Design a protein around this ligand. Structure first.
Ligand SMILES: CS(=O)(=O)CCCn1c(Cn2c(=O)n(C3CC3)c3ccncc32)nc2cc(Br)ccc21
Lengths: 443, 443, 443
């Protein structure tokens, strides 16, 4: 779509818009299974088969030993605390109840894909992705018993190594992740397996299309939870994201310190909007993601997780156009630390240049085209390739889109430095006003 | 065991207890070795062997190039700063002293497991996990020399690929981890290798049992440090956790913001207990782990690292029953930021619901069964599957255990908002009282 | 070199010096390519080949599906915000322009290494690391067509698995990293490939030597960005670090809380220098890296990234010798939280011991050799192996180098606790003085 951006000189911040939401709001749990074999002079070929067979037995033993316990795993400090795999773990707990695994084993007898309702009413999609039981009970078992121990060909050795390797790698992953992995690898679930899983999922076509067109994101937002080995069934729960909010407007708020620029060192005061992060319209409110690194952007689609959000009044948006607006108390932090830096935005760069710092913007071939004066300023990515603040070189994002420079008096100029409350972190416009009023009162 | 939980309405916090400790207090260093070979018309089979031989030589060269340098690698801000592999690195430094590697090579001549005392008095367990010297000097060397270059069979090609692969993977791991890996993979140390290493370790039976029953945790708390290649010996130090504290009571403290709930926006004041995290009885004091994510829970056993702890007076526990107790100055932060969230506990959910936020608790099949009013409240996981605060859905942990709701007046009601010191982060009950006394004095 | 260290008793801090810089200041983008094949009764050998061929087709399809979108990915809070792969992504965008891939394909027709200037003037080094087109169009295609479907030998099966495996692993990596990986693995770029890439790079001999002697660090500071599949060319951009600052002095500042040690609990005040981290002389200024974990140390060489730095006046160094110096306003935080901890330095250990905490330093064989009294103190690593503060055991670094203990009155003694501004985080000597002056004024 049309990604656009606005820089507000008055508050040293910038909003990038035109993004479309894809928010993980829920979890879907599928049960992925591997059917196992329960099995007991040597030539070179049979020796290899027995070595591979040992790797198979060891992997099973290792996974069994692994499940002796229950499976487990600016404004960010305001977030709540969730339990990411509580739902997957609950489904896994149900799989341990007597008869439960047997239901699944029976379901997948004549097909590899099936929906099974568990005893607690939970309806899970089930998937047998590998039948090692059939392979070992055929092909291999006849050669290790009938002509003890050899009627063997090299192609069988190769084939067994190929088939067993998936089990070995899944086991490797679980072994260094304490039975819980994320992102979900293609060993857990191949691309085709995941795609057909998504297709057979109880979701809308919009969700199926969204997930199929972004499987690499789906993998990053999924968990594989090692669950149970019982009755020749190896089962792990794959916990998949449900995107219950799709195609709502999203915008990214970038902020940077705004300081006075007086000559005398240490006489300057600063203010920074702390409400930077991703914002998405969501159900009459606004979902706010303070750790913008928790969201992943694909073109103009932004994938976030509501577990890492606050739910805010939509008036929080007013802080962008009018930070002194009466409907929402815009959040800021204050300080006297006027250090220089830059924030690279979607479509340009914010530059907070203070003191003796050299701040410039350059083009690839031309070199320096703008030298920043002290204060907070901005340049768009059109005709600009890099920005330098001090010894730090920044490459700007080269995505196409228009920027708008909104001129306005830096609001830091509205404050008397003699009564300015610095070192306020979790503050706001009203809180700062409140403290200023008290300092003025005592004077 | 019996996991139980208590919610304190007065302070918007909850303690989960019944856990048993397993604290890493020390480090054990073992030396793991791979014995290497020092070696110099083609048919298809020999061509493959030579290709595999090149992968072997390259891996050795790569690891040699790698060791041109020395190996290196709310209240969390209060923690000290350690050097995690200082002990392993020190042992590795000793291995570089002349004659030192030769001692090990000699020790493992007729066995794969041996204890060796180093020249500095350190007694290390040593383990030859792979003898590539013997394999290459036999089997392979006779075919690349005698009938230059071919008396070869396909099973030898396969076998060499299998044996060499471990070396290639170990090399891969070290290459993207700058010679220091964690968790320790099954390439570094297979499950059987680790289990027998643990068995031969100079530790108590309780420790051996604990480590053997939790090898996946042991791996996560271990380091593999690439150390030396000298005299056909490849050696890496595996640094294993020593659990010097086992089976002491542990409890997890969950906290959430407690705010007044007045109608007028921005007129509310908040307070949050900052001492959330894991607590374990330890040697007459209490080990406090502020970053509860640094601990791993397996059923009712909790694995932590003392490097990520403070050592506190046991009176810190009093803050749970009486936050105004005279024996310990309970830590809190203050603010006016009354945003809504939930904290998912071991056995329920704390809900901090403020403003216009929709806060509910639901069952799987029934739907909404409780709607929270403004304030801090709690619900147990019995009959509850999810909690929703705003647009954020939380699944609760479904583990069995009893919760106790301890009623009490929210302590935030005891404060006059006109003299309440907000934006205090590293604060406490007494510090807040102290500041209130000064504001009252000037009035 | 000579690593030395000084401990300042007056401020509970220590500086380690003698380090040499290697700062990533820029980015170089190379284009790595894999040439692909565009291809359409069974015996065991051909069945395996067709299975491997399917893995090849699936990998291609998977990577194609992957690129349906644009590629994306105390005092730390003061840092700016960059876009790490903006330059690589920009080059990738250029590769999508018509004719652009064809230029590269033509360039690498008769050689595997070539420099190509793109249409936007960017000169990129290009590298064909694998020719699957040639392998499949030869060897394989003649057997799947001519004697449909079998004139096959087992060595061809093996060889194809070996050659195809790299493609499968690269695909695996991109699949769980959303097309952007770091560190750059040996699948993306083998050690030999990287070394010759570095050799053919447009950089000085000093840089080539530095990068070649530290390829494992180079990998950690590099990105592999999956870019395009078009006209039988698979291309990913590898974004390599440019070290524009080499061999300037670096030093590491360690700090720890300095508190009064009065008997009455809660009557103590504390101060901590917040400017801890790595410092490097750089272009007439000092590059300051607050998150010292963002730098990697190899012997006496320290690798940092300027994106994680502030650019400071060189007078910031004065805070080490004279924290009350008039030329730079040294940064500190204040509190009343007198908890005990230790900071392990390059050549010793800082111990902040308060309250009832047991604080000691030990040798390997002798045991406790020093018991710390309350206050901030230090011990060198000479003759010391461990330090214990409370229940936390610390191993000290055993690297060789001399320490100097600089005696001086703890500056916390210069403050009157009755007017001491605690809970100041982003503070400084002057700011604290300023607040003290106001509290004294109102009294
Ligand atoms: C890891 S850390 O940065 O050190 C956590 C520091 C938390 N902390 C706070 C709250 N706070 C933050 O969270 N950040 C930035 C990390 C986002 C701040 C920046 C500027 N002012 C206060 C900030 N106030 C404190 C007062 C005292 Br005394 C000791 C710690 C304090």
């Amino acid at each position: 779509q049309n990604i656009t951006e606005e820089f507000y000189q008055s508050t040293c911040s910038a909003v990038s818009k035109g993004y479309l939401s894809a928010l993980r709001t829920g979890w879907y749990t599928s049960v992925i299974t591997i059917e196992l074999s329960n099995i007991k002079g040597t030539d070179a070929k049979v020796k290899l088969i027995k070595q591979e067979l040992d790797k198979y037995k060891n992997a099973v033993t290792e996974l069994q030993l692994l499940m002796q316990s229950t499976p487990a795993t600016f404004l960010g400090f305001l977030l709540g605390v969730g339990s990411a795999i509580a739902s997957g773990v609950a489904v896994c707990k149900v799989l341990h109840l007597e008869g439960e695994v047997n239901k699944i084993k029976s379901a997948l007898l004549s097909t590899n894909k099936a929906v099974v309702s568990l005893s607690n009413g939970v309806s899970v999609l089930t998937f047998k992705v590998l039948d090692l039981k059939n392979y070992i009970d055929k092909q291999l078992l006849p050669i290790l018993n009938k002509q003890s121990c050899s009627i063997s060909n090299i192609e069988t050795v190769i084939e067994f190594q190929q088939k067993n390797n998936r089990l070995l790698e899944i086991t490797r992953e679980f072994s260094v992740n304490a039975g819980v992995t994320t992102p979900v690898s293609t060993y857990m679930l191949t691309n085709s397996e995941l795609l057909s899983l998504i297709n057979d999922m109880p979701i809308t076509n919009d969700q199926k299309k969204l997930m199929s067109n972004n499987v690499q994101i789906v993998r990053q937002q999924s968990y594989s939870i090692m669950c149970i080995i019982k009755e020749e069934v190896l089962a792990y729960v794959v916990q998949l994201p449900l995107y219950g909010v799709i195609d709502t407007p999203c915008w990214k708020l970038h902020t940077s310190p705004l300081c006075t620029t007086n000559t005398k060192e240490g006489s300057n005061i600063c203010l920074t909007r702390t409400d930077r992060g991703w914002y998405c319209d969501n159900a009459g409110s606004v979902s706010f993601f303070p750790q913008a690194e928790t969201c992943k952007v694909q073109s103009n689609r932004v994938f976030c997780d509501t577990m890492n959000s606050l739910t805010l009044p939509s008036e929080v948006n007013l802080c962008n156009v009018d930070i002194f607006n009466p409907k929402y108390d815009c959040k800021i932090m204050t300080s006297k630390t006027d250090v220089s830096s830059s924030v690279i935005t979607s479509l340009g760069a914010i530059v907070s240049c203070y003191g003796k710092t050299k701040c410039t913007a350059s083009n690839k071939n031309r070199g320096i085209i703008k030298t920043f004066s002290n204060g907070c300023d901005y340049v768009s990515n059109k005709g600009v390739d890099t920005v330098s603040v001090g010894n730090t070189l920044y490459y700007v994002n080269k995505q196409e889109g228009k920027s708008l420079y909104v001129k306005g008096e830096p609001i830091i100029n509205f404050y008397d430095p003699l009564v300015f409350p610095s070192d306020e972190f979790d503050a706001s416009i009203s809180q700062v006003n409140e403290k200023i009023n008290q300092s003025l009162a005592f004077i």
